[PDB]
């Protein structure tokens, strides 16, 4: 699978002849191949079917979720815990089982997190599998001189294949004879209109010539013949799909932030461990014990619940998107939208609707605009004049297209119409603002019609007049505005008729150039009432001689048409630009249309100008003007092929409104890479297969759901099941909101760290009884704390998020030193002091004053000393003093909850005050209530001092942590005050997360 | 990166900041932590002002007194060879440490020791738990009272010829009055004989029914010759109000002990305000695993 | 008081546990109320 030979632009043998082609592959132009030869080739190279994607067993994507960066840290933590347990078992008798419990708990946490994440990605995979609808297809091949319909998987290279309007091109054919055969190259080449396929060659580029049919393309109208040149995976879209599958995935931003976070956590953990290891060796302890101390401090500095909290947090933000019809296949792809700073979009199928629609109409020397929006939410065009009625009659009559049977349910715009695109748009507009066309057509019987000639460039027909008072005949013709203009002498103004003096002729020329400059295709409709005295009701006007006056007709008005954009496209583009997101158009369509669509959707803001526009406004050559005075630039694909890396970098560095036209899929990928080379996040939004190499390499791909291709849908990361573009704005908003929330939750789960470690450090340095047990640390990190941290995600914005500039990736991180200085440095310290306060209080009320506690651990732990004198002289047995120590663990845990109240309140907002934002988050309130109920339940329920070792507390102890909590609240309140009054001051660059 | 973030020479920065910055941060943390320490100290001083020096506010975790002994057993087992002298040294050393506090030289003069009834007697109340009267007075407890286990005659105390001793002691509790069982028809078998009301009885036995036969003659030594604690040594007024206070002791000689076999001996005290616990094996009773292997 | 000062060594932990449980239950209920207050 040579990638370089697949990265190159497609080549071909189009520039040849029919004899050279038949001589190279071997095939009879009038008899085709033989059955024996056909089967020989079929078995010689393989069926004309694309290879299936690389399957994936379910146990693989499960082992993947069990690993990563966070789960790996928890894995090493469990390993360390079991190592310390082994050492304690082989070195000391009666080894405590604390470490074995902590290790099995860590393993269970990792397994549960993996199961949840895997279940979510499986849910998305099922709803994704319910969209692949593959119905078998059979092609028409001519062998030995006979026509036969065989499965698409049996077509080989060399046989003759015939196509008919409505069928799909099986393989890559070389047209040999066509009869007005049009093809739809929107999916592969992105051409919005049907390009006619002719046996002759026209352009050096195989995608531009008309003598080559492409795989997966459909023949709109006409019939054609052709020799299969390319078959199977070797086709154009086959190489494109193989290239897409042979591309890497990448590494999103949220993952990099989590990685740097783990880097800091491990830095401070190994630092505190190696330091207290040298210190313990300096105080007399043995090596065997110091090793256990090192492992214990390292394990103690690992957040077991931050993993489950982060996963549930992200999942919560994913369900809303699923409520608005925005589905993400992965789980971290929900934040990439918020960090995006350059969105590369596609035109056909993404920015537009890929459907021809009547845009402007000319009548009564006045340009009228029609509604070209999917849901028909706009302004009417004043349907009160007679001119409009005559125009409707001309369009509704001189038209051979008719809605496909059985469409009485779909809307007027989304129904299937059999015919050309122009006639379909005209029929839809008439059926939209003029009622049932079937009755309008049956109301006037068509007598004689002259088809559309390539020379006549006009379609005319005569029908009877439905006027019950006039039995005359009506003649209606339509065609190019110039040809029709040269055949008229009157004008239907406001109903009456008038001459065709040069005044209206010049107004018609200006109208023609006005509608033409808009990138639209304009047509002209005219009619005439045949005098019943010279052509009676019985005379038959056979289409043989000049039976109708070609000239002296009555021109009624022009009718333009073009593919419009989706409803929420301009608003979404404006919203993205407001948030500082650079919108760059990338499409393989004509530049004359790409520029118009760009200006109409907001990519090229009204007022900006290109070098060609300046040269045209000044009437001077283009080589004289300076390229620095042009903000917007239109880069052609042909020119892009001959451009160096530095040139592309400068193009993106100096032009703010860039539009890449006529760019091949490979060029699209090159553009995405050129955008990433600088350092900005990229989001590519597409629908066809030409966007597959762009959606894969981009930081985040957005594929359309209804109008999107299966390849681009399978290679993208986010799917828009409703084809709504405003979802991009919603996503960029949610990506930021959940980011500030992740910061708050991380600081919350990190503040408790200190009051959980400090006790052991003072235990080894000061030799005091153990303050915080292991089952209490577990009841804190994996119990109470979970609900509040999860609730911190439901926090609303503080300021306008859709107003600030995108976060800088090289400077503004997720976990900086400003957070560590708060959680580990100021709040956690106060919480630890409060815990030690409740501790000393419990031991002072029972008889052990603070002066006699320093230096007792040796006898306080000894299991054979049944006489420990306290500060008053009483003798305490071993189990009695142990009961008191356990009650001190229970009160320490409750003190932790008490200080966590004020920590969750000061963590709710990062800058704003509580009296401003407000306590409108019901989840946070529920978290506090549950957090307290759980602590009371764990202490007062009978049989807990036996199972978990937690004794009941006396109502006077529960109030030992209250002052510390209020102090924490006041300190953070004054903190979040100087930041507001003093922007940019010390408190901001020192404590502003 | 590695080198720059450590020391650059254009902005004259070290680790990231200039000279004046590390100073601003260090000064801020010093003032902050200083205030934290002062606040914690104040909140601890008010706590010192909340407690009394003559009595523990809560005395419920020490209501049923324990029963400890003189030898220090690692797993409540006494195993020693009658030949190798370096086998029972850890025992004699402890025993000696305990009895070394009842030396007559320590108990001398009128203050603060007072001669009490040579025969068990009743309680003695030296007033309330106040500082009005000076240091209260405690009764004297002579070594010699313990006859064959005193370290005055046979320093080893018995361990020399297969006849070890075990000095039992009741855990000191402030304001605790020991109360013995009354003479009513319900009383254990053992306790009937020698019902001196003023004596708290201590009686050892065998954990299992089999071991009975293998245990010989439990000879107890105590005040007045009884196997208990005289009520006159109570109550205890606490260290502050009664320094130089001695708690009664009871010696137990396990004469006629079967050789080369682990014997489980459970000793137990009897009384009203005495209750045992299935979790704490030292509350009121105690267990010893003697094995005189020779 | 005096010899029969047995109360000086007793604490009614039973009643304390009963009250602490009643309170815990109440707090849990209130929490649920607040959580579901709005979805009905
Ligand atoms: C409480 O009383 C303890 C015993 O008191 C003795 O008996 C009472 C009734 C009175 O008569 C009193 O006057 C007696 O002293 C008392 O402990 C005793 O302290 C002395 C002084 O250190 C010890 O004497 C020394 O003995 C060692 C060898 O001891 C052997 O036996 C003991 C057991 O008894 C073992 O533990 C040892 O390991 C030995 O196996 C001698 O080597 C040592 O020599 C020193 O003196 C000689 C002159 O005699 C000098 O030439 C040397 O250079 C040395 O300076 C002493 O003779 C005595 O052993 C010890 N008794 C016990 C049982 O340990 C205790 O201190 C008192 N405590 C308080 C707080 O009042
Ligand atoms: C604590 O309690 C014991 C037992 O008390 C007895 O049982 C209690 C449950 C309760 O019912 C008491 O009312 C009851 O007395 C006290 O010890 C007992 O003392 C008596 C009197 O000395 C003894 O009875 C003697 O029994 C002898 C044979 O066993 C008999 O020969 C004795 O004769 C004496 O009395 C007769 C008149 O009956 C007289 O004629 C004789 O000349 C001679 O004096 C006498 O009947 C019991 O055996 C004792 N019980 C035991 C277990 O030894 C004990 O004194 C008491 N302690 C205190 C401090 O109060
Ligand atoms: C029994 C007793 C109990 C004891 C309990 C102890 C509990 C432990 C509590 C806290 C642990 C502290 C450990 C150190 C934490 C430092 C945090 C840290 O390393 O965070 C990482 C930051 C990175 O941040 P960033 O990503 O934003 O960088 C972006 C840079 N870009 C963008 C320019 C490229 O790196 C930096 O900050 C740079 C590194 C700065 C390192 C400073 C080291 C100071 C440590 C000790 C000083 C002691 C001196 C005492 C004497 C005072 C004089 C009297
Ligand atoms: C000595 C002991 C020390 C203890 C220290 C720890 C303390 C931590 C616990 C509680 C702290 C409470 C802090 C009180 C803050 C009140 C702030 C407030 O009232 O700001 C008013 C806001 C602002 O409104 P606005 O103008 O934006 O509205 C605009 C409406 N428009 C848009 C229609 C115009 O109004 C709103 O937020 C809407 C109404 C919200 C009402 C909230 C009431 C609930 C408050 C606390 C719950 C209790 C938790 C107890 C935990 C213990 C469990 C056992
Ligand atoms: C929206 C949804 C709402 C759902 C809310 C659900 C809330 C559920 C509320 C209550 C159910 C809790 C479980 C009930 C446990 C009953 C245990 C019990 O009745 O024990 C009685 C006996 C004690 O007898 P004794 O006094 O004679 O013992 C003397 C022992 N001496 C003398 C040797 C010291 O027990 C014994 O003997 C053996 C003791 C056995 C230990 C069982 C304790 C379980 C341990 C940990 C599980 C707790 C996890 C936390 C879950 C939180 C959920 C929110
Ligand atoms: C959504 C909100 C959730 C809230 C729930 C709170 C989360 C809790 C988080 C961590 C706590 C789990 C730690 C497990 C502790 C097991 C302790 C253990 O095994 O100790 C072993 C003891 C032995 O003790 P010893 O040597 O003194 O015996 C001497 C006996 N002699 C002397 C008489 C012979 O044996 C015994 O206690 C025998 C009785 C066995 C008791 C097993 C209790 C298991 C408790 C919890 C496990 C299920 C939790 C699942 C919920 C997860 C929530 C996310
Ligand atoms: C049991 C637990 C008890 C806990 C109690 C904690 C109480 C301690 C609270 C605060 C004490 C710390 C004061 C430190 C003052 C020296 C700091 C210093 O040297 O600062 C210098 C700067 C002035 O330099 P510059 O910005 O002009 O230079 C620009 C330079 N460039 C560019 C780097 C920004 O200072 C400034 O900015 C002004 C900023 C001053 C910092 C205000 C922080 C106030 C926070 C809390 C006070 C509220 C206590 C409430 C307690 C109620 C108890 C019931
Ligand atoms: C905005 C957020 C609202 C949040 C509301 C949350 C709801 C709170 C729910 C319940 C709290 C009430 C608890 C009442 C329980 C009393 C039960 C009782 O009988 O308990 C007696 C103990 C005395 O125990 P002992 O050891 O002496 O005897 C032990 C004797 N043995 C052991 C021998 C039996 O006493 C105790 O537990 C004392 C109980 C604690 C006293 C409550 C203090 C309230 C503190 C601040 C609130 C101030 C509000 C001011 C209004 C401002 C309006 C604008
Ligand atoms: C949508 C609306 C939802 C509403 C739901 C409402 C739920 C119901 C709410 C409250 C129910 C209250 C139940 C009160 C139970 C009292 C039990 C009690 O007082 O037992 C105490 C005694 C044990 O005393 P001890 O002598 O061994 O003490 C130790 C003494 N030393 C250690 C010094 C020797 O019990 C014993 O003996 C026998 C104990 C037998 C086992 C009883 C099981 C109780 C366990 C859990 C039930 C509590 C759940 C409350 C809801 C909390 C939600 C988080
Ligand atoms: C101490 O125990 C010994 C047994 O070890 C008792 O003496 C035995 O008595 C039986 C008769 O009942 C004789 O057959 C044995 O020969 C004796 N053995 C020895 C070593 O003497 C002795 O009576 C016990 N003494 C006490 C006071 O309990
Ligand atoms: C138990 C006691 C004695 C330990 C006291 C440790 C104190 C002095 C430690 C704990 C956390 C530390 C701070 C943690 C974070 C930062 C941010 C960094 O960019 C510079 C160092 C600085 C500012 C540290 C200074 C020293 C510090 C406050
Ligand atoms: C608001 C903050 C900064 C005020 C903190 C005040 C601190 C420094 C004050 C409050 C209470 C004071 C203590 C109160 C009690 C004692 C006991 C006395 O025998 C000597 C002084 C000593 C040891 C004091 C030292 C200073 C102290 C701890
Ligand atoms: C919003 C803020 C200010 C409310 C603070 C409420 C605090 C003070 C409440 C919440 C839970 C309460 C405790 C819950 C449980 C018990 C056990 C019970 O047997 C006596 C009351 C006692 C000891 C309570 C004392 C007051 C308490 C701690
Ligand atoms: Mg497209
Ligand atoms: Mg933890
Ligand atoms: Na990707």
Q: Give the 3-state DSSP-derived string for A488-512, with helices as H, strands as E and coil as C.
A: EEEEEEECEEEECCHHHHHHHHHHH
Contact A879, A914 (CB under 8 A): no
Contact A664, A594 (CB under 8 A): no
Please name the residues in contact with A66: beta carbons below 8 A apart, sequence gap of 6 or more. A110, A111, A114
Q: Which of A354, A429, A342, A340 is nearest to A597 (CA)?
A: A354
Contact A270, A298 (CB under 8 A): yes
d(CA A931, CA B145): 61
Experimental technique of record: cryo-EM
Q: Where are the alpha helices (DSSP H) in chain B?
A: 19-50, 89-99, 211-214, 238-241
Q: Which of A660, A511, A671, A518 is nearest to A599 (CA)?
A: A518
Peptide linkage before A412 cis (omega within 30 of 0): no
Distances (CA, A) of A419 to A15, A39, A427, A432, C29: 32, 37, 10, 18, 68
Contact A629, A615 (CB under 8 A): no
**A887: helix, strand or coil:** helix
Residue A24 DSSP class? I
A346 is catalytic: yes
d(CA A964, CA A962): 6
- Quick one: tokens of B217? 């003659």
Please name the residues in contact with A96: beta carbons below 8 A apart, sequence gap of 6 or more. A88
Please name the residues in contact with B200: beta carbons below 8 A apart, sequence gap of 6 or more. B170, B178, B180, B228, B229, B231, B269, B270, B271
Q: Which of A323, A345, A321 is nearest to A335 (CA)?
A: A321
SS (H, E, C) B182-194: CCCCCCCCHHHCC
Cβ of A987 less than 6 Å from ligand 7: yes
Count of pairs with CB atoms under 8 A, one residue in A, one in B: 99
Contact A433, A566 (CB under 8 A): no
d(CA A830, CA A967): 9
Please name the residues in contact with C2: beta carbons below 8 A apart, sequence gap of 6 or more. B125
The secondary structure of chain A in percent helix, strand, coil, rounded to multiples of 5, reads: 50, 15, 35
Q: Residue A552 class from Cβ within 10 Å (0-12 exposed, 13-18 middle, 19+ buried)?
A: exposed
Please name the residues in contact with A452: beta carbons below 8 A apart, sequence gap of 6 or more. A458, A459
- Quick one: tokens of A721? 């099941």
- The residue written with tokens 């296949």 in the block is A329
Residue B162 DSSP class? T
CA dihedral in degrees (A489, A492, A497, A503; nearest 10)? -60
Contact A350, A686 (CB under 8 A): yes
State whether C8 and B175 contact (CB < 8 Å). yes
Residue A796 DSSP class? P
Distances (CA, A) of B27 to A828, A977, B14, B34, B286: 20, 21, 18, 10, 59
d(CA B277, CA A160): 100
Distances (CA, A) of B117 to A316, A348, B198, B230, B234: 81, 114, 12, 10, 13
Beta-strand relationship, A682-686 and A632-636: unpaired
Number of H helices, E strands in chain A: 38, 29
Distances (CA, A) of A201 to A23, A161, A185, A208, A588: 18, 19, 17, 9, 21
Question: Residue B36 CB: number of other CB atoms within 10 A?
Answer: 15
Instruction: Classify the phi-psi angles of A261: left when phi > 0, otherwise alpha if psi is within -120 to 50, otherwise beta.
Output: alpha
At residue A396, φ and ψ (nearest 5 deg) are: -65, -25
Q: Residue B67 class from Cβ within 10 Å (0-12 exposed, 13-18 middle, 19+ buried)?
A: buried
d(CA A562, CA A712): 26
Cβ of A879 less than 6 Å from ligand 5: no
d(CA A710, CA A691): 11
Residue C38 contacts B, CB cutoff 8 Å: no
SS (H, E, C) A707-762: CCCHHHHHHCCEEECCCCCCHHHHHHHHHHHHHHHHHHHHHHHHHCCHHHHHHHHH
Please name the residues in contact with B268: beta carbons below 8 A apart, sequence gap of 6 or more. B67, B202, B203, B204, B205, B276, B284, B285
Beta-strand relationship, A138-143 and A195-196: unpaired
- Quick one: tokens of A530? 């045949």
Contact A183, A212 (CB under 8 A): no
d(CA A140, CA A224): 11
**Active-site entry in A184, A346, A589, A972:** A346
Distances (CA, A) of C17 to A467, C11, C27: 98, 12, 15
d(CA B145, CA B159): 20
Atom of ligand 13 nearest to the CA of A936: 15
- The residue written with tokens 């988050």 in the block is A921
Nearest to B177 among C3, C10, C11 (CB): C3
CATH of domain A64-117+247-340+726-993: 1.20.1110.10
E-assigned strand segments in A334-427: 342-345, 360-362, 367-369, 402-403, 417-418
Instruction: Classify the phi-psi angles of A22: left when phi > 0, otherwise alpha if psi is within -120 to 50, otherwise beta.
Output: alpha
Between the CA of B107 and the centroid of ligand 1 the distance, in Å, is: 19
Question: Residue A118 CB: number of other CB atoms within 10 A?
Answer: 17
E-assigned strand segments in A231-365: 326-328, 342-345, 360-362
Instruction: Classify the phi-psi angles of A156: left when phi > 0, otherwise alpha if psi is within -120 to 50, otherwise beta.
Output: beta
Beta-strand relationship, A458-464 and A446-450: antiparallel
CA-based R_g, chain A, Å? 39
Q: Residue B51 class from Cβ within 10 Å (0-12 exposed, 13-18 middle, 19+ buried)?
A: middle
- Quick one: tokens of A194? 């049907």
Distances (CA, A) of A379 to A373, A375, A382, A797: 10, 12, 9, 36
Nearest to A864 among B73, B169, B174 (CB): B73
- Quick one: tokens of B188? 């254990």
User: How many residues are listed for chain B in this entry?
Assistant: 294
d(CA A807, CA A803): 12
- The residue written with tokens 């960029």 in the block is A732
- Which run of H or E residues covers position A585? strand A582-586
d(CA A86, CA A102): 14
Q: Which of A891, A844, A853 is nearest to A763 (CA)?
A: A853
Q: Residue A596 class from Cβ within 10 Å (0-12 exposed, 13-18 middle, 19+ buried)?
A: middle
Contact A335, A815 (CB under 8 A): no
Please name the residues in contact with A508: beta carbons below 8 A apart, sequence gap of 6 or more. A362, A481, A485, A558
Domains in chain A: boundaries: 2-47+127-246, 64-117+247-340+726-993, 341-353+565-725, 354-564
What fold does the segment set A2-47+127-246 form as a domain? Answer: 2.70.150
- The residue written with tokens 């125009």 in the block is A391
What DSSP string runs through A615-648? Answer: HHHHTS-TTTS-GGG-SEEEEEHHHHTT--HHHH
Question: Residue A180 CB: number of other CB atoms within 10 A?
Answer: 14
Between the CA of B199 and the centroid of ligand 2 the distance, in Å, is: 20
Contact A332, A315 (CB under 8 A): no
**A987: helix, strand or coil:** helix
- Which run of H or E residues covers position B15? none
- The residue written with tokens 């709040």 in the block is A827
d(CA A972, CA A979): 11
Instruction: Classify the phi-psi angles of A297: left when phi > 0, otherwise alpha if psi is within -120 to 50, otherwise beta.
Output: alpha
Buried b / exposed e over A933-967, threshold 16 CB at 10 Å, is bbbbbbbbbeebbeebbbbbbeeebbebbeebbeb
Q: Residue A802 class from Cβ within 10 Å (0-12 exposed, 13-18 middle, 19+ buried)?
A: middle
State whether A877 and B283 contact (CB < 8 Å). yes
What DSSP string runs through B187-225? Answer: S-TGGGSS--TTEEEEEEEESSTTHHHH--EEEEE-GGG
d(CA A856, CA A875): 14
d(CA A8, CA A4): 6
Q: Which of A453, A12, A10, A18 is nearest to A200 (CA)?
A: A18
Ligand 3 pocket test, candidate residues B16, B28, B30, B36, most atoms within 8 A of CB? B16
Q: Which of A253, A259, A239, A270 is nearest to A172 (CA)?
A: A239
Resolution in A: 3.7
Q: Residue A815 class from Cβ within 10 Å (0-12 exposed, 13-18 middle, 19+ buried)?
A: buried
At residue C36, φ and ψ (nearest 5 deg) are: -85, -5
The CATH class given to the A341-353+565-725 domain equals alpha beta
Contact A28, A19 (CB under 8 A): no
Q: Which of A780, A782, A773 is nearest to A949 (CA)?
A: A773
Question: Which residue has the least CA distance to atom 65 on ligand 1?
Answer: B100
Half-sphere exposure of A72 (CA within 13 A, CB side): 9
Give me the residues paired with residue A227 across strands.
A160, A174
- Which run of H or E residues covers position A876? strand A875-876
Q: Which of A964, A934, A948, A959 is nearest to A788 (CA)?
A: A934
d(CA A457, CA A487): 12
At residue A861, φ and ψ (nearest 5 deg) are: -90, -40
Give me the residues paired with residue A497 across strands.
A492
The CATH class given to the A354-564 domain equals alpha beta
User: How many residues are listed for chain C in this entry?
Assistant: 40
d(CA A231, CA A617): 50
- Quick one: tokens of A406? 């059985």
Question: Residues A7, A12, A13, CA angle at the centre, nearest 5°?
Answer: 160
- Quick one: tokens of A937? 């339940």
- The residue written with tokens 């981009």 in the block is A698
Is the dihedral angle over the CA atoms A75, A80, A85, A90 positive or is it negative? positive
Q: Residue A234 class from Cβ within 10 Å (0-12 exposed, 13-18 middle, 19+ buried)?
A: middle
**A816: helix, strand or coil:** coil
Atom of ligand 10 nearest to the CA of B256: 1
User: How many residues are listed for chain A in this entry?
Assistant: 993
- Quick one: tokens of A513? 């150039």
Residues with C-beta less than 6 Å from any ligand 9 atom: A 933, 937, 941-942; C 13-14, 17-18, 21-22, 24-25, 28-29, 32
Residue A762 contacts B, CB cutoff 8 Å: no
Please name the residues in contact with A587: beta carbons below 8 A apart, sequence gap of 6 or more. A190, A346, A347, A348, A351, A594, A660, A661, A663
**A954: helix, strand or coil:** coil
Contact A904, A972 (CB under 8 A): no
Distances (CA, A) of B76 to A920, B167, B288: 62, 14, 5
- Quick one: tokens of A801? 């998020």
d(CA B150, CA B136): 28
- Quick one: tokens of A265? 């956590």
């Amino acid at each position: 699978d040579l990638d370089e030979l697949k990265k190159e632009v497609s080549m071909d043998d189009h520039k040849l002849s029919l004899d050279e082609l038949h001589n190279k592959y071997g095939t009879d132009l009038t008899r085709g191949l033989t059955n024996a030869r056909a089967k020989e080739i079929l078995a010689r190279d393989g069926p004309n079917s694309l290879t299936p994607p690389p399957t994936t067993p379910e146990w693989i994507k499960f082992c993947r979720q069990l690993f990563g960066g966070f789960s790996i840290l928890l894995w090493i933590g469990a390993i360390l815990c079991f190592l310390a347990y082994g050492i304690q078992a082989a070195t000391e008798d009666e080894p405590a089982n604390d470490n074995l419990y902590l290790g099995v708990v860590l393993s269970t946490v990792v397994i549960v997190t993996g199961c949840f994440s895997y279940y979510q990605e499986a849910k998305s995979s099922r709803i994704m599998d319910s969209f692949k609808n593959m119905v078998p297809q059979q092609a028409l091949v001519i062998r030995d001189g006979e026509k036969s319909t065989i499965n698409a998987e049996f077509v080989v290279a060399g046989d003759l294949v015939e196509v008919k309007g409505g069928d799909r091109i099986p393989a890559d054919l070389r047209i040999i004879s066509a009869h007005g055969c049009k093809v739809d190259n929107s999916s592969l080449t992105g051409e919005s209109e049907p390009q006619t396929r002719s046996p002759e060659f026209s352009s050096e580029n195989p995608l531009e010539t008309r003598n080559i049919a492409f795989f997966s393309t459909n023949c709109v109208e006409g019939t054609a013949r052709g020799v299969v040149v390319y078959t199977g995976d070797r086709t154009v879209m086959g190489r494109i799909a193989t290239l897409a599958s042979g591309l890497e995935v990448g590494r999103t931003p949220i993952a990099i932030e989590i990685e740097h976070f783990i880097h800091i956590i491990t830095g401070v953990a190994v630092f505190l461990g190696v330091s207290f290891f040298i210190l313990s060796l300096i105080l007399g302890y043995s090596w065997l014990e110091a090793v256990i101390f090192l492992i214990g401090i390292i394990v103690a500095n690992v957040p077991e619940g931050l993993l489950a909290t982060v996963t549930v947090c992200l999942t919560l933000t994913a369900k809303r998107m699923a409520r608005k019809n925005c589905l993400v296949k992965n789980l971290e792809a929900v934040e990439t939208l918020g960090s995006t700073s350059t969105i590369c979009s596609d035109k056909t199928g993404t920015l537009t609707q890929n459907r021809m629609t009547v845009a402007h109409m000319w009548f009564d020397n006045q340009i009228h605009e029609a509604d070209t929006t999917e849901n028909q939410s706009g302004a009417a065009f004043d349907k009160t004049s007679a001119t409009w009625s005559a125009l409707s009659r001309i369009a509704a009559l001189c038209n051979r297209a008719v809605f496909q049977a059985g469409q009485d349910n779909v809307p007027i715009l989304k129904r299937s119409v059999a015919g050309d695109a122009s006639e379909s748009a005209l029929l839809k507009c008439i059926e939209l603002c003029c009622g049932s066309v079937q009755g309008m057509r049956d109301r006037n019987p068509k007598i004689v019609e002259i088809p559309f000639n390539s020379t006549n460039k006009y379609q005319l027909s005569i029908h009877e007049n439905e006027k019950s008072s006039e039995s005359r005949y009506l003649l209606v013709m339509k065609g190019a505005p110039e040809r029709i203009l040269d055949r008229c002498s009157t004008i239907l103004l406001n109903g009456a008729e008038e001459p065709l003096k040069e005044d209206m002729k010049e107004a018609f020329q200006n109208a023609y150039l006005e509608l033409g400059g808009l990138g639209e295709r304009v047509l002209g409709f005219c009619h005439f009432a045949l005098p019943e005295d010279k052509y009676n009701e019985g005379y038959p006007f056979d289409a043989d001689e000049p039976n109708f006056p070609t000239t002296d007709l009555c021109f009624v008005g022009l009718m333009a048409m073009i593919d419009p954009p989706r409803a929420a496209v301009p608003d979404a583009v404006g919203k993205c630009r407001s948030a500082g997101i650079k919108v760059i158009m990338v499409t393989g369509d004509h530049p004359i249309t790409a520029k118009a669509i760009a200006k109409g959707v907001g990519i090229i803001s009204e007022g900006n100008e290109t070098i060609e526009d300046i040269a045209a406004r000044l009437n001077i050559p283009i080589g004289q003007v300076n390229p620095r005075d042009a903000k917007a630039c239109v880069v052609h694909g042909s020119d892009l092929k001959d451009l160096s890396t530095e040139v592309l970098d400068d193009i993106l560095h100096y032009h703010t409104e860039i539009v890449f036209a006529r760019t091949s899929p490979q060029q699209k990928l090159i553009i995405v890479e050129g955008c990433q080379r600088q350092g900005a996040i990229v989001a590519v939004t597409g629908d066809g297969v030409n966007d597959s190499p762009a959606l894969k390499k981009a930081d985040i791909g957005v594929a359309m759901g209804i109008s999107g291709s299966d390849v681009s849908k399978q290679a993208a990361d986010m799917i828009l099941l409703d084809d709504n573009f405003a979802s991009i704005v919603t996503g960029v908003e949610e990506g930021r909101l959940i980011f500030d929330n992740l910061k708050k939750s991380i600081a919350y789960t990190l503040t408790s760290n200190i009051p959980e470690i400090t006790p052991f450090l003072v235990f080894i340095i000061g030799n005091v009884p153990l303050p915080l047990g292991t089952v209490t640390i577990l009841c804190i990190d994996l119990g109470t704390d979970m609900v509040p941290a999860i609730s911190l995600a439901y926090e609303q914005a503080e300021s306008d998020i859709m107003k600030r500039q995108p976060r800088n990736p090289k400077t503004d991180k997720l976990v900086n030193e400003r957070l560590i200085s708060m959680a580990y440095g100021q709040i956690g310290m106060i919480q630890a002091l409060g815990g030690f306060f409740s501790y000393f209080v419990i031991l002072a009320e029972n008889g052990f004053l603070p002066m006699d506690l320093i230096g007792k651990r040796v006898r306080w732990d000894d299991r054979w000393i049944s006489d420990v004198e306290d500060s008053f002289g009483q003798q305490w047995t071993y189990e009695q003093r142990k009961i008191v120590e356990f009650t001190c663990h229970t009160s320490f845990f409750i003190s932790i909850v008490v200080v966590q109240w004020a920590d969750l309140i000061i963590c709710k907002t990062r800058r704003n005050s509580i009296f401003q934002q407000g306590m409108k988050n019901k989840i946070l309130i529920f978290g506090l209530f549950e957090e307290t109920a759980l602590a009371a339940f764990l202490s007062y329920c009978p049989g807990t001092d036996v199972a978990l070792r937690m004794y009941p507390l006396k109502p006077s102890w529960w109030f030992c942590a209250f002052p510390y909590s209020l102090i924490i609240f006041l300190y953070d309140e004054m903190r979040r005050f100087i930041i507001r009054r003093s922007p940019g001051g010390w408190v901001e660059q020192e404590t502003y997360y | 990166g590695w080198k720059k973030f450590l020391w650059d020479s254009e902005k004259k920065e070290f680790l990231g900041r200039t000279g004046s910055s590390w100073f601003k941060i260090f000064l801020f943390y010093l003032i902050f932590y200083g205030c934290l320490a002062g606040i914690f100290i104040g909140t601890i001083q008010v706590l010192l002002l909340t407690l009394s020096d003559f009595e523990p506010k809560y005395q419920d975790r020490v209501a049923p007194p324990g029963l400890s002994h003189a030898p220090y057993a690692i797993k409540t087992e006494i195993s020693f060879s009658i030949s190798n002298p370096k086998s029972y040294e850890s025992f004699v050393k402890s025993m000696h440490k305990l009895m070394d506090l009842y030396n007559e030289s320590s108990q001398a003069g009128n203050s603060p020791f007072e001669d009490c009834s040579d025969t068990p007697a009743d309680y003695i109340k030296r007033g309330d738990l106040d500082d009005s009267q000076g240091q209260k007075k405690a009764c004297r407890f002579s070594r010699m009272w313990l006859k064959n286990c005193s370290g005055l005659d046979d320093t080893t105390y018995g361990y020399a010829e297969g006849k070890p001793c075990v000095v039992a002691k009741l855990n000191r509790i402030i304001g605790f009055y020991p109360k013995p069982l009354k003479n009513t028809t319900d009383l254990p078998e053992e306790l009937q004989a020698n019902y001196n009301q003023y004596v708290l009885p201590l009686r050892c036995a065998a954990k299992r029914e089999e071991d009975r036969e293998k245990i010989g003659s439990i000879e107890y030594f105590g005040l007045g010759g009884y196997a208990g604690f005289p009520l006159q040594y109570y109550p205890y007024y606490g260290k502050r109000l009664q320094k130089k206070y001695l708690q009664p002791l009871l010696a137990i000689q396990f004469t006629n002990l079967t050789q080369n076999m682990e014997l489980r001996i459970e000793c137990k005290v009897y009384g009203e305000n005495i209750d045992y616990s299935e979790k704490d094996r030292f509350r009121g009773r105690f267990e010893v695993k003697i094995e005189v292997k020779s | 008081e005096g010899p029969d000062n047995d109360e000086r060594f007793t604490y009614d932990y039973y009643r304390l546990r009963v009250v602490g449980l009643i309170v815990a239950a109440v707090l849990c209920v209130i929490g649920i109320i607040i959580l579901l207050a709005g979805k009905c």
